[PDB]
Amino acid sequence: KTIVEKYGKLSVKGNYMVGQYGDTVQLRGMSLFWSQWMGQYYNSDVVKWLRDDWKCTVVRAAMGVEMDGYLENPDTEKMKVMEVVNAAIAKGIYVIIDYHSHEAQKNPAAAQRFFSEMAKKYGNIPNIIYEVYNEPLQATSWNKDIKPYAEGVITKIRVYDTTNIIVVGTRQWSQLVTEAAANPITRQNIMYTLHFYPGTHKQELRNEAQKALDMGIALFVTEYGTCDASGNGNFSPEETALWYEFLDAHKISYCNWSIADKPETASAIVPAASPYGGWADYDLTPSGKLVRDDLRLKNGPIFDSL
Numbered sequence: 001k002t003i004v005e006k007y008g009k010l011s012v013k014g015n016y017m018v019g020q021y022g023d024t025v026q027l028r029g030m031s032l033f034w035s036q037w038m039g040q041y042y043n044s045d046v047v048k049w050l051r052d053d054w055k056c057t058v059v060r061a062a063m064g065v066e067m068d069g070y071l072e073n074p075d076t077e078k079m080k081v082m083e084v085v086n087a088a089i090a091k092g093i094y095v096i097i098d099y100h101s102h103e104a105q106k107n108p109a110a111a112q113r114f115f116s117e118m119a120k121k122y123g124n125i126p127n128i129i130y131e132v133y134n135e136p137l138q139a140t141s142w143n144k145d146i147k148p149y150a151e152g153v154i155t156k157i158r159v160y161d162t163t164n165i166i167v168v169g170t171r172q173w174s175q176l177v178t179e180a181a182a183n184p185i186t187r188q189n190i191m192y193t194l195h196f197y198p199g200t201h202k203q204e205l206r207n208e209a210q211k212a213l214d215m216g217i218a219l220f221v222t223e224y225g226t227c228d229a230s231g232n233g234n235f236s237p238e239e240t241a242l243w244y245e246f247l248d249a250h251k252i253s254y255c256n257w258s259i260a261d262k263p264e265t266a267s268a269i270v271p272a273a274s275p276y277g278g279w280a281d282y283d284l285t286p287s288g289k290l291v292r293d294d295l296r297l298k299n300g301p302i303f304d305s306l
Contacts, residue, residue: 001306002092003057009126010094010165012189012218016251017165020126027094027253028299029056030268030291031223033260034100035080036064036073040275041259042080047087049277050259054292055299058094059084060222060255062134065101071110078114082121089127096167096222096255098131105133105140105149112156123161130157131222133169135195142171142179154187167220169193173229174222175201178208181215191218194252197225197266198243199234206246213250221247221254226287227265231257235265237290244294256291268292 008020019025030050032041042061050056061084063070063077070077081097088095097118104111115130122128132153136146150168157166168185170176174193184190192212196205209219224243228234247254260267268288273279284292 003302004092004094004127006302006306009163010129010189011163012165012191014216015213015218017191017218017220017253024251025253026248026251027058028295029058029060029093029255030054030295031060031098031255031258032062032084033258033262034062034064034069035077036067036069038258038260038262039080042084043275044083044087044090045276046259047084047093048091049279051091051093053277053279055295055303056093057299057302058096058129058253058255059088060096060098060131061085062098062100062258065099065107065111066103069100070114071107074114078117081118085122085128089125092127094127094129096129096131098134098222100134102135102137103140104136105145108149108152111149111153115153116156116159119157119160123164126164128161128164130161130164130166131169131193132166134193134223135173136169136171138172140171142176143183146171147180147183147185151185154185154190158187163189165189165191165220167191167193167222175205175208177212177217177219178215181212181217184217191220194219194221195223196221196243197227197229197231198236198239199225199228201229202239202242206243209246219250219252221252223257224254225257225266226290231266232264235286240290248298
């Protein structure tokens with residue numbers, strides 16, 4: 001039995017993600033980096049290694065949209081996403097299809113087309129989680145920009161995929177979850193994005209998250225780092241652990257940024273680390289070691305249960 005066979009189809013009940021057999025589910029895994037810049041890792045060898053060695057129960061495909069991404073090169077970037085999705089299906093783990101944009105509402109037809117295609121192809125499959133708008137900017141209003149954009153994309157997904165989870169980004173780089181909680185999308189199996197970087201974001205952002213939970217919505221940490229929000233500097237292992245404590249207490253799923261070999265703190269692997277996986281201890285950065293150790297410790301028993 002695989003992880004996806006264990007938990008099955010996912011849905012949302014109140015503050016929680018639940019599975020079809022009555023489990024309350026918490027996923028943990030890794031995000032790939034921008035598909036147009038780290039596309040060499042968008043392959044089945046990486047996905048298998050993330051399951052077998054890192055004990056990921058979810059992987060996130062971060063499809064770049066602007067800056068020579070999907071809008072300019074739709075076939076190439078969609079292909080990379082589908083390779084990762086296909087591998088997650090073959091290996092029995094969950095997969096997030098992330099529309100990795102800061103301005104999705106500016107090209108809603110492109111986003112609707114992409115998600116319609118993904119939902120038509122994969123709609124009957126329990127592994128799939130959709131993430132329709134990575135990180136709205138500080139200027140991007142929930143009520144006026146994000147919510148109407150997301151509702152249009154959700155309707156398109158739901159033509160073909162009636163119940164898989166859809167995660168919706170929030171204002172200020174997916175920080176301001178209380179604004180979504182005050183005016184939620186009143187549709188089935190919707191969650192809301194929280195992103196944190198513990199060199200920058202500490203108890204004040206945990207308090208924001210708690211206030212959103214108080215208001216009745218479910219959060220998914222589709223991206224977090226171990227360092228400050230720029231992705232470089234202020235490696236913060238103790239603060240990361242305070243976040244893990246909070247997320248585990250609330251059964252909030254989490255994926256780390258990122259599988260990339262860029263020479264910055266947030267990268268999990270060293271420059272030139274193999275595109276096929278197989279990374280030994282000397283191929284991991286301090287951030288990668290911290291995150292991999294947490295995955296092995298917490299997800300190991302889930303794999304062992306089968």
